[PDB]
């Protein structure tokens, strides 16, 4: 049928896996997916034990593509040591600034995600799976609902899938504008019909999740890897990129590059290579000043030779690369990051509620040259004191990127201090 208008985000791949079809900016329906050998990995998976599938996903070195990079197999193993029923949740909230990697899988190759969900659900013994897609992805929502009907039609969903005795329904839930609803416990609260308030962890969802039951939450891009792991075997999958951080990775690249878009590359690719080898270098061939890893980290031009992997010295995060060049004001950019966290704190934790607000409100005064000496000292203090008593990652990192700009671009901040 007809879907809402979607901008045609550029997509390029060196691996031809996640983006084999999604490199073309249009919906690939079940026939095209089947033509490329789609749903054969599901047929293979259903002739394996759930435990075998977990073992392959473990040995694959697949890490959470949501941004934390938690080992996916090890998450599943924690879930299955707890009695059922169990739930599988696909996190499609994708609301990090600069981050548009998951939507191109959803909107262009939805059956890659659906096949991943069915295999993962079977591996953990979940008969009920959810996609939680952000409200601002209405096309993604309608495309997934249509795709799910296609899968049902072909007998990949419903009861007794392909005579396996395995039952699965996939329910598509929509967000309604809250970044925090991407936090796995806030997501689950939203699925339960409530406000997106994160829960104290532990327990982690794999112990106590949806309706208090063992629940695996995985990112769109994580799940999209599962069909490849089963199809190729974990061994062949480990041939892709470095053996310790293996498999394809999507890199959404934006700001001051000639070729902004999503790049499928191995995680041994360096940040410099992403910008200059793949994204066509900078607009006007201007010097890179900084790279914002979404709203999480700020890397200086001295940090471009780092691997795009989940290693301690790696880029990590979502793989999100926002490029700022020599004429971009770092304090102006820090203000946009502060404004983001101000708008998105859920307010359960006091230092997060007041800290996100005050960090933005004071940094606006600093930017407009209306800050008192007290406001300056205030801004520094609140930036270092958003984290205390926080029960989720938003409070933990709301000051992180901005602190890194203060440390890495002091001369620029000092200009504002006068």
């Amino acid at each position: 049928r007809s879907y809402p208008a979607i901008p045609r985000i550029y997509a390029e791949t060196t691996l031809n896996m996640l983006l084999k079809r999604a490199k073309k900016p249009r919906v690939h329906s079940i026939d095209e997916y089947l033509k490329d050998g789609g749903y054969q990995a599901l047929e293979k998976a259903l002739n394996m034990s759930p435990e075998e599938i977990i073992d392959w996903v473990d040995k694959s070195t697949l890490r959470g593509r949501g941004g934390a990079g938690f080992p996916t197999g090890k998450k599943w193993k924690f879930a299955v040591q707890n009695p059922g029923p169990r739930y599988f949740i696909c996190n499609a909230d994708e609301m990090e600034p600069g981050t548009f990697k998951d939507r191109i899988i959803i909107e262009r190759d939805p059956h890659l995600l659906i096949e991943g969900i069915i295999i993962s659900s079977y591996a953990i013994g979940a008969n009920e799976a959810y996609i939680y897609i952000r409200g601002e992805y209405p096309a993604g929502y309608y495309i997934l609902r249509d795709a799910i009907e296609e899968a049902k039609k072909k007998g990949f969903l419903g009861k007794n899938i392909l005579g396996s005795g395995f039952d699965l329904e996939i329910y598509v839930a929509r967000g309604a504008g809250a970044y925090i609803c991407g936090e796995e416990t806030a997501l689950i609260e939203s699925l339960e019909g409530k406000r997106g308030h994160p829960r104290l962890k532990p327990p982690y969802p794999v112990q106590k999740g949806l309706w208090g039951k063992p629940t695996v939450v995985n990112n769109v891009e994580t799940i999209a890897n599962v069909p490849f792991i089963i199809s190729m075997g974990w061994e062949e999958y480990r041939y892709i990129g470095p053996s310790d951080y293996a498999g394809p990775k999507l890199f959404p690249v934006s700001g001051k590059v000639k070729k902004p878009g999503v790049y499928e590359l191995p995680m041994n690719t360096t940040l410099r290579e992403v910008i200059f080898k793949y994204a066509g270098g900078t607009l006007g061939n201007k010097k890179v000043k900084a790279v914002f890893s979404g709203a999480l980290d700020c890397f200086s031009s001295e940090e471009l030779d780092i691997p795009m992997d989940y290693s301690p010295l790696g880029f990590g995060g979502t793989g999100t690369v926002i490029v700022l060049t020599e004429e971009d004001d770092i304090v102006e950019a820090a203000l946009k990051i502060a404004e983001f966290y101000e708008h998105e704190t859920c307010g359960q934790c006091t230092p997060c509620r007041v800290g996100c607000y005050e960090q933005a409100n004071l940094l606006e005064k600093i930017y407009k040259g209306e800050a008192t000496e007290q406001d300056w000292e205030g801004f520094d203090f609140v930036n270092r004191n958003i984290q205390p008593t926080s029960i989720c990652g938003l409070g933990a990192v709301a000051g992180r990127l901005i602190r890194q700009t203060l440390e890495k671009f002091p001369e620029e901040w000092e200009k504002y201090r006068k």
Binding site: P4, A5, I6, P7, R8, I9, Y10, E94, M95, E96, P97, G98, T99, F100, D102, R103, E128, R134, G135, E136, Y137, P138, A139, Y171, A173, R174, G175, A176, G177, A178, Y179, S190, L191, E192, G193, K194, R195, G196, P252, V253, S254, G255, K256, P260, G261, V262, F292, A295, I322, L324, D328, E332, A333, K336, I337, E339, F340, H343, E344
Partner: protein, 155 residues
């Protein structure tokens, strides 16, 4: 207050979709905002009854989620990204073009109730910055002439 049959039928479809009625709350509110061009406060008591939830639960949920608007009826929501990448690449040019064409700023509605500009955080299309939506449709802003063409399609 009563839901017109064509809306009530859609609401019941959402309530029947998930295993538990209360899971349908955001799909129902999206559906109500789609029908009326906002969330009528009088709509919330009947929705609570259909979801078998307390009214205060439903009111709290409407308050929490930024896409829901209880204040202004608008046929078309022009959602304009004001986050880091769209700001770097020309949110201000988009807002200037929107003001030149429609005579309104963020948070305002045109006198005919046709268009409301809604400033939003990152819409997840940052490579196509600066980004805007017109209801469910999403676009890169190129220029005032191009924006005028796009807007002419919404009648």
């Amino acid at each position: 207050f009563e839901f017109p049959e064509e809306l009530k039928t859609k609401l019941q479809e959402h309530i029947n979709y998930f295993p538990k009625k209360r899971q349908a709350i955001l799909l129902c509110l999206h559906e109500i905002q789609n029908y009326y061009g906002y969330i009528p406060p009088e709509s919330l008591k009947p929705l609570a009854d259909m979801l078998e939830l307390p009214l205060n639960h439903v009111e709290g949920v409407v308050a929490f989620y930024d896409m829901f608007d209880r204040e202004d009826k608008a046929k078309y929501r022009i959602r304009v990204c004001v986050s880091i990448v769209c700001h770097l690449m020309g949110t201000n040019k988009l807002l200037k073009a929107l003001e030149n064409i429609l005579g309104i700023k963020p948070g305002e509605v045109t006198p005919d109730g046709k268009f409301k500009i809604v400033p939003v955080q990152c819409l997840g299309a940052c490579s196509e910055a600066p980004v805007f939506m017109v209801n469910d449709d999403e676009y890169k802003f190129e220029s005032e002439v191009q924006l005028n063409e796009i807007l002419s399609r919404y009648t």
